[PDB]
Symmetry: C3
Subunit: 162 residues, 3 copies
Amino acid sequence: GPEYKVAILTVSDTVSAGAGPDRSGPRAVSVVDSSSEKLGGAKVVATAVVPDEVERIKDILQKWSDVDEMDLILTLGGAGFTPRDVTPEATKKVIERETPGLLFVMMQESLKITPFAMLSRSAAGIRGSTLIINMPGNPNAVAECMEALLPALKHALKQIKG
Amino acid sequence: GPEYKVAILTVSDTVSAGAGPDRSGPRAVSVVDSSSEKLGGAKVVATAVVPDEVERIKDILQKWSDVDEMDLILTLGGAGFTPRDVTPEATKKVIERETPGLLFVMMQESLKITPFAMLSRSAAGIRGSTLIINMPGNPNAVAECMEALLPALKHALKQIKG
Amino acid sequence: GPEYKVAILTVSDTVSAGAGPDRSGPRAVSVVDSSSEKLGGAKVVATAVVPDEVERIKDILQKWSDVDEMDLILTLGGAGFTPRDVTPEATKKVIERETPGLLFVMMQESLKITPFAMLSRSAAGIRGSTLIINMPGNPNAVAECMEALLPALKHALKQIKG
């Protein structure tokens, strides 16, 4: 069906333990769905929630990439200065080829909105033919980051296939 | 009893040999005192001088992080193109979690003053609960960097903390 | 002879298999010459063509740096999202000290021209006394990249020398 399969992974001890709801996952889904056309026809086919533990985060990025063959994986949360925030360190263990331009743009554009954006420690890269991008836990943030990436994201997914 | 303990590491073969006064060290200290309130009550409680040798740099960063439990270490010097400049490589070996946002802002703002800022090779990150940031050797640089980071550095330290 | 020896490595399956010409090499050469004065008298004394293979790329970056003692290697291509593009992964295995500010500037400046600049995965750094800078595969790009760095590239090369 979908030209590009997208999966969104929410990282949060609080959500994962049933102690709270996921306010970022829906919005993330909603932004991808709303931009399907500019993304060359992409659709979120899976979401999941892990806690702030690297091995849990690694296993999913691995599975989604190697086995389910997702084309785009966004992570939400676990990428700030909190002691538990380990999303980037797990992300960095699984990508094969880094994509610093995407990080640069996310940081450049979100700084225009607030200096607290410098607290984002996001990683991004390519494993196999999957693009993986770390994004922040705030709901407003995915929208801000996806607006920033949108001009090039379709061309990026196109190039990873060839 | 300061809320956040800051420590300042001067890196310079020259200074460490006694061949000259430390110019960067004290000024740096003076900047932090000056910004104490904006930093949520941070104060320098220790300095040290080392030469341009990775092992010595690693040892003090390690000991200040692991044993003295400093909240903020700023290195000054050893982060340019000169053959002996190895501060960032030392730093990279001791941090656990990178914080590229701090490098981006320092780099974005310093470029507005001069294109020679592109020669800063600063690294930065977190080891345990210690934030570590490489800053240049010029005395005026510390202050320009501190001004650039100041809007978010209070919120950074409070997040590391708990 | 030349105050600074520059070498240009062109990375491309197509070019290396004699299935197409090098349109980037020549511009790169041309830009360096046209910029000899501002680079404190530099000159391209070698070029080569390798395919998209990490070992073939490392071998030359290693040889030019360690044996020929070049002072400035530029690479052209293999630094985007295509499956075969491994120039940056090659480059990172050989440099000893990274130079994130050259990357920050090349990205910042080229983003002003187009958002597809975010797809550049360039790396850059120093091995021995050799500056290594990745650049994109378009001919226009080397010129845009070199305009961004030229203000400081002289001081950089002078600082590596001693």
